[PDB]
Every structure is written in structure tokens, then in C-alpha cells.
Amino acid sequence: SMEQVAMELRLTELTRLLRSVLDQLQDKDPARIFAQPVSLKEVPDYLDHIKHPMDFATMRKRLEAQGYKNLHEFEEDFDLIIDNCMKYNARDTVFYRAAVRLRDQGGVVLRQARREVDSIG
Known part of the structure; x- marks a missing residue:
């Protein structure tokens, strides 16, 4: 249908x-701290924690498959990056500190992304 196409163009x-x-x-x-999955070869207990x-x-990978339907879904995943790191790593670590700086920056x-998503529809 033409409606399915329009919806697909929006996505x-x-x-x-x-x-x-x-x-x-x-x-x-x-520093590319969050660029790749935590390695289960190098951190074998990781899934016991996270x-x-x-x-x-x-x-x-999810984005390029058009797997984010809305900004909320995308933000959920970004917050997981930060929140996983701040639980597994202590406050006094370069990892935790990197996550805080990433969250703040x-x-x-994300504030303006939300306005753009709402604005353009």
C-alpha cells in the first residue's frame, strides 16, 4: 500500500x-571504551553481572537494519551502555569515569534529537 510505503519512508x-x-x-x-562488546573471552564472568x-x-547493527522504531528505543540502548559500565566498574576506574563523561556530554x-524527532514528526 501507499500507507506502508509512507511509514517506511518515515522509518x-x-x-x-x-x-x-x-x-x-x-x-x-x-578512547573507544564503548565501541565494541565486552569480550567474554577476556571477562568470562561478565554475564553473571550484566x-x-x-x-x-x-x-x-540494529540501526542499519532499521531496528529502532522510535528515539525511546535508541535511548534505551545508549543508557544500557552507560548503566552497565557504572555497575560493573568501580567509581575510581577509567571505565566508570568514561561513562559519566559520555552520559553528561x-x-x-539527545535533548535536541528529541526536539527534532517531535518537530519533523
């Missing part, structure tokens, strides 16, 4: 905007 355009959001958030992680692992590569980007 495509959301995917465009989320790709730009993702790039902007990932620039806020210049039940829903997340990272920027995993998000990018990403807030700005």
Missing part, C-alpha cells in the same frame, strides 16, 4: 537522524 528518515545522533554520541568516547550487554557496534545531543 528511513528516523534511521538517518539516529545515525547522525549515534555518530555524535560516539565522538564523545574518544544481563543485557550493549555497545556502539551492536547499536549500529550525550545529554546535550
Whole structure:
């Protein structure tokens, strides 16, 4: 139908905007701490601690399959990256501190993304 096509064009355009959001958030992680999944070879107990692992590569795979239907879903995954790290790692670690800085800096980007998503519809 023509309606399914229109809906599909909306999703495509959301995917465009989320790709730009993702790039902007990932620039806020210049050490690449959150770029890839925590390795279960190197952290073999990880899934005993963290039940829903997340990272920027995993998000990018979901994004490119148009697997984010709305900004809320995308933000859920970003918050998992931060929140998983702040539980597994102690306060005095470069990992925890990287997550705090990513959260603080990403807030700005996500604030305007929400306005854009609502504005363009």
C-alpha cells in the first residue's frame, strides 16, 4: 500500500537522524571504551553481572537494519551502555569515569534529537 510505503519512508528518515545522533554520541568516547562488546573471552564472568550487554557496534547493527522504531528505543540502548559500565566498574576506574563523561556530554545531543524527532514528526 501507499500507507506502508509512507511509514517506511518515515522509518528511513528516523534511521538517518539516529545515525547522525549515534555518530555524535560516539565522538564523545574518544578512547573507544564503548565501541565494541565486552569480550567474554577476556571477562568470562561478565554475564553473571550484566544481563543485557550493549555497545556502539551492536547499536549500529540494529540501526542499519532499521531496528529502532522510535528515539525511546535508541535511548534505551545508549543508557544500557552507560548503566552497565557504572555497575560493573568501580567509581575510581577509567571505565566508570568514561561513562559519566559520555552520559553528561550525550545529554546535550539527545535533548535536541528529541526536539527534532517531535518537530519533523
